[PDB]
Ligand binder design. Structure first.
Ligand SMILES: CCCCCCCCO[C@@H]1O[C@H](CO)[C@@H](O)[C@H](O)[C@H]1O
Ligand SMILES: CCCCCCCCO[C@@H]1O[C@H](CO)[C@@H](O)[C@H](O)[C@H]1O
Ligand SMILES: CCCCCCCCO[C@@H]1O[C@H](CO)[C@@H](O)[C@H](O)[C@H]1O
Ligand SMILES: CCCCCCCCO[C@@H]1O[C@H](CO)[C@@H](O)[C@H](O)[C@H]1O
Ligand SMILES: CCCCCCCCO[C@@H]1O[C@H](CO)[C@@H](O)[C@H](O)[C@H]1O
Ligand SMILES: CCCCCCCCO[C@@H]1O[C@H](CO)[C@@H](O)[C@H](O)[C@H]1O
Ligand SMILES: CCCCCCCCO[C@@H]1O[C@H](CO)[C@@H](O)[C@H](O)[C@H]1O
Ligand SMILES: CCCCCCCCO[C@@H]1O[C@H](CO)[C@@H](O)[C@H](O)[C@H]1O
Ligand SMILES: CCCCCCCCO[C@@H]1O[C@H](CO)[C@@H](O)[C@H](O)[C@H]1O
Ligand SMILES: CCCCCCCCO[C@@H]1O[C@H](CO)[C@@H](O)[C@H](O)[C@H]1O
Ligand SMILES: CCCCCCCCO[C@@H]1O[C@H](CO)[C@@H](O)[C@H](O)[C@H]1O
Ligand SMILES: CCCCCCCCO[C@@H]1O[C@H](CO)[C@@H](O)[C@H](O)[C@H]1O
Ligand SMILES: CCCCCCCCO[C@H]1O[C@H](CO)[C@@H](O)[C@H](O)[C@@H]1O
Ligand SMILES: CCCCCCCCO[C@H]1O[C@H](CO)[C@@H](O)[C@H](O)[C@@H]1O
Ligand SMILES: CC(C)C[C@H](N)C(=O)O
Ligand SMILES: CC(C)C[C@H](N)C(=O)O
Ligand code: NA
Ligand code: NA
Ligand code: NA
Ligand code: NA
Lengths: 509, 509
């Protein structure tokens, strides 16, 4: 089996798995939509009661499986729980990252296409004070790129440029993955993460210099970092905060598990896992939090900044920020640096969510790395046509896989490891080889608090939120539901084939 | 490998593969849409220049593959042509029958549901002369069963009854297939084919007694059997005639090939193949041709009968015929006998188009028959939800797979066997073990006339017909296109896995 070559390499690869579009695009919107500082308390609490303990659990399950030649959850769950149902529940750790990759790589491709156009100055020209006259050209630019519907049909028509850039983006992901863990992912992380850090710091500095008649970047920071204890009682804020913690730490996607499956059996995961998690959190709250929101607030004031965030997932990052930058000297190049940052952040994460399918095909069906990578890319490339052409298909996938799925899977993996496999065995396994030990209090957090917290969350979710989504959506949501259900049945079939191959092989040995 | 147990068994199974909904539903519409007797000359000529020679070619390829343990075209094409492209072209002999099964089993399920309701008398009551007042209730009955759209959305809503009957129909197909070739398919054919023949003869007799002020059944027969040489120049009629010959003989679906793969290496296929073909043709032109058209013509006259046929694929068989029968004593029970006939005709054919996927999984991935059958049923059952809920998805599948695909595949398989593998080797292989020999003239028909006839047909098709279909259809056709393209990529992946398994096994031996 492959292994990470260096400690630093492992840490930066895991940090790049985590630090992605979630930090720079998703966090500012979630924080802004949910009251700024009012979001931050539930967020910090979720980091402590869910993010940290689940991070250690995933690293441990991955390292444990990897020791036996298995890096993905159909096999790993079965190692932990010798029951046919383990293998079926395990399919979610292939299905979730595959479905997420299907829309995530497309959005990543937009950042590359925007980086290219901004570099070469093929960008809109706003009319030199009316905000709408400045924003409209950037709205039109995004809408033309991805091809937002102008009529009643729920159909998208991406530009030829966007489509070619998607192909290029898939090629770049493949170019890294095909080189494998140490020579591909790890080597890339050592270049990409320092680059990303420097680009991000530069942009934070530039933004901190923004001052207009409507405010300063300081006003943005104050909005994000001033607590509002009256919102601690709002379930929606808690649900938002927990969903963001899963998404941002890559938990419940089978991706931390698969990366950790390349950690040597004896090598520490306590300090390493904690470090990757903290690095992500710094990039999220310090870097991601200090760019878009303070820029928007400086230019528009808090109330308008908030309304922009609520407006769409992509408004702040693909329309508003470049529009604001366009009002400054060098602003087109600053937009380039922003999209380049987003691109490296996305790329280091998308390789992490394609690696589970790759590991499964290699570990369980015994494909060569080359074939595993190319068939993985083929399935993602083909499937992404749904997200490219069907309006809101992206939203539907992000909901089932990237929102509900990961929380369900996090609870599942915790129950399997800490309850079924055995709490003391799990605890022992997490701590084995640790440079530090997990604080004792965390045993009770993992065994009782985390699953209870998650279980309640899912119930309140399913009761007061999802009913309005199974009944109040356009009929075309069933196109995406049908297809991703088919993907699950497909992956289940592959796990069935893997077991038949194993059986036929055991009979020959 | 399994083998057919008896000569008669083999013949009736192959006759039941052929004799299906194509004979009783499709033929009358095609003949009626294309001038009755004006259709019949091109049809008879296509039977001689395409149907017969391709039937022998498929039996021979199947028997040839079966001798080496292979019943499906990815492997068989590769045996005939040791080239990677053979295996890829061979995927069409899994994809075509799977896609066709996906809509064909659903339509078969309607015949079972109608048989049930007609048996129990849960049928419409027409108002005792106005044709519309008699037809409308039967139109409404079909539209409620399958759930035709009442608004603008291209969405179907089948009744709960129709949905349960689809499940039952899948179960019945599975119940036969899971017993295998000799104890399942062959044993069923020995019961079903005589039943079908007797039901069909009874219905022809009953219809021949129809006389109304608008005409007699005799008028229907005269319309169908009176040549119109002025239509011999119409390409559309030729295209219609050839498409019907493929569909009705099950050619180009990989299904005759797979059945023939269970014929012993030494056993005759010349007389056997010819007999199955002739039996189908009698059931088509004598039985299928003498029921619906003469009934409709007797009641409505030729011009109206023709207009009914042009009205929809299903109007004549599911609306008009039962409406006409309802005007006669015992007419509800006669409708039962009609739908029961259609059900046995469909069932004996649907098992034939599921068997290729089953044979592939058994032969190439080494699944047990039980697992091959159940996974096949699962994929068909799941996929059929597209045809059940998306208006016109059925039409799109029937076009790409059941219309264009089979003609393309017929030409492909002929080129592979007779040109690449070798005309003299092919000829030798067809005739080996024959109780009779193929007439010498047919060597030149197979080598030159058949491929030339097909090639011209496809060109004239692609030039003067398909352009109007890639540009003049509703956007939702891309939902079905996307999904069936995904099915091809899926089957290609399975052929890739089969080759890797074979490779790993050869290295162990
Ligand atoms: C591998 C799956 C292929 C399914 C069909 C893909 C069709 C892609 O179609 C392409 O779309 C681009 C973006 O809109 C257009 O700019 C191009 O002109 C068009 O060829
Ligand atoms: C990495 C570089 C990818 C380049 C893809 C080129 C796509 C060209 O796309 C074409 O460009 C023309 C000129 O702008 C436009 O007028 C056309 O509408 C557009 O189709
Ligand atoms: C399901 C939650 O939808 C969320 O919408 C947000 C914008 O409102 C985005 O920032 C998130 O990516 C998306 O998950
Ligand atoms: C379910 C996902 C399948 C999407 C396949 C879409 C195939 C491409 O479809 C083509 O796209 C072009 C670019 O928009 C259009 O200009 C063409 O009119 C259209 O034929
Ligand atoms: C919500 C959970 C937050 C846990 C923060 C743990 C901080 C560390 O807590 C420390 O743990 C050590 C090891 O068990 C003990 O020896 C120390 O006395 C204790 O203070
Ligand atoms: C491609 C096949 C599409 C068929 C699905 C048709 C079912 C439409 O049903 C609709 O589904 C929506 C989404 O759940 C709901 O919001 C609506 O209440 C419901 O009427
Ligand atoms: C295996 C793939 C499952 C995808 C969702 C299938 C949903 C079937 O839904 C069923 O449809 C029937 C027919 O309209 C309705 O009568 C039933 O009330 C409904 O439960
Ligand atoms: C093989 C027998 C299958 C029987 C399936 C029963 C489906 C019942 O279906 C129900 O039947 C009621 C009474 O007719 C109707 O009023 C309801 O609308 C319908 O949903
Ligand atoms: C593609 C040809 O469409 C045909 O339509 C006919 C009704 O017009 C049906 O009888 C055939 O089944 C169908 O193939
Ligand atoms: C692409 C094929 C997917 C189709 C899945 C449809 C899932 C079922 O959808 C359900 O169907 C019922 C019966 O029509 C409706 O009454 C319900 O409103 C709808 O939710
Ligand atoms: C369109 C093709 C129709 C072919 C009909 C063939 C009828 C049989 O033709 C016969 O074939 C025998 C064997 O070669 C010869 O010995 C006979 O002389 C010949 O008449
Ligand atoms: C589920 C994803 C659907 C996206 C497909 C959108 C492409 C629509 O494009 C349309 O396609 C039709 C069918 O070929 C053609 O008749 C029209 O000319 C064309 O505009
Ligand atoms: C940042 C990592 C991926 C995030 C995917 C977010 C998916 C949901 O985001 C959605 O939010 C807005 C809601 O009005 C819409 O305007 C957008 O179309 C978008 O699909
Ligand atoms: C008989 C074996 C399967 C035949 C499938 C036929 C598919 C095309 O048949 C179509 O023809 C008519 C055209 O107006 C439509 O009314 C129907 O909805 C039907 O889909
Ligand atoms: C799905 C994950 C790889 C996403 C990543 N953690 C991010 O924040 O963008
Ligand atoms: C697809 C084939 C099995 C159809 C069959 N030959 C019929 O006439 O209905
Ligand atoms: Na992150
Ligand atoms: Na990343
Ligand atoms: Na037939
Ligand atoms: Na049949």
């Amino acid at each position: 089996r492959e292994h990470w070559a260096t400690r630093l390499g492992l840490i930066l690869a895991m940090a790049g798995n985590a630090v992605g579009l979630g930090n720079f695009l998703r966090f500012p919107v979630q924080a802004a939509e949910n009251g700024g500082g009012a979001f931050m308390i539930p967020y910090i609490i979720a980091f402590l009661l869910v993010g940290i303990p689940l991070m250690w659990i995933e690293w441990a399950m991955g390292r444990y499986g990897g020791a036996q030649g298995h890096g993905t959850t159909p096999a790993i769950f079965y190692l932990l729980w010798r029951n046919r149902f383990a293998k079926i529940l395990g399919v979610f750790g292939l299905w979730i990252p595959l479905v997420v990759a299907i829309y995530y790589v497309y959005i990543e491709s937009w950042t590359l296409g925007f980086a290219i156009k901004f570099l070469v100055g093929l960008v809109p020209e706003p009319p030199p004070t009316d905000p709408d006259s400045i924003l409209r050209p950037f709205k039109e630019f995004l809408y033309s790129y991805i091809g937002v519907p102008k009529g009643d049909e729920p159909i998208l028509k991406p530009s030829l440029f966007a489509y070619i850039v998607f192909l290029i983006t898939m090629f770049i992901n493949v170019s890294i993955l095909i080189r494998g863990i140490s020579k591909g992912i790890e080597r890339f992380a050592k270049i990409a993460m320092p680059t990303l850090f420097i680009l991000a710091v530069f942009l934070v500095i530039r933004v901190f210099l923004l001052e207009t008649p409507n405010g300063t970047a300081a006003d943005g920071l104050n909005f994000l970092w001033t607590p509002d204890f009256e919102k601690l009682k709002d379930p929606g804020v808690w649900i938002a905060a927990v969903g963001q913690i899963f998404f941002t730490l890559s938990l419940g996607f089978g991706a931390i598990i698969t990366y950790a499956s390349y950690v040597r059996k004896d090598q520490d995961i306590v300090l390493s896992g904690l470090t990757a998690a903290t690095l992500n959190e710094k990039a999220e709250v310090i870097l991601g939090g200090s760019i878009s929101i303070p820029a928007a607030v400086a230019f528009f004031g808090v109330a308008n900044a908030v309304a922009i965030a609520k407006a769409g997932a992509f408004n702040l990052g693909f329309i508003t920020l470049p529009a604001i930058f366009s009002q400054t000297a060098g602003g087109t190049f600053l937009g380039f640096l922003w999209f380049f940052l987003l691109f490296f952040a996305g790329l280091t994460s998308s390789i992490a969510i394609m690696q589970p399918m790759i590991a499964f095909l290699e570990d369980e069906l015994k494909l060569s790395r080359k074939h595993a990578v190319l068939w993985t890319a083929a399935i993602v490339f083909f499937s992404a046509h749904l997200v490219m052409f069907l309006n809101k298909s992206l939203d539907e996938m992000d909901f089932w896989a990237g929102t509900i799925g990961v929380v369900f899977f996090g609870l599942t993996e915790l129950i399997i490891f800490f309850w079924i496999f055995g709490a003391d065995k799990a605890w022992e396994e997490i701590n084995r080889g640790g440079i530090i030990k997990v604080p004792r209090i965390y045993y009770y957090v993992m065994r009782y608090i985390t699953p209870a917290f998650l279980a309640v969350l899912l119930v309140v979710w399913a009761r007061e939120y999802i009913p309005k989504i199974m009944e109040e959506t356009h009929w075309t949501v069933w196109i995406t539901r049908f297809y991703i259900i088919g993907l699950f049945l497909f992956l289940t079939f592959l796990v069935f084939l893997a077991e038949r191959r194993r059986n036929h092989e055991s009979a020959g040995t």
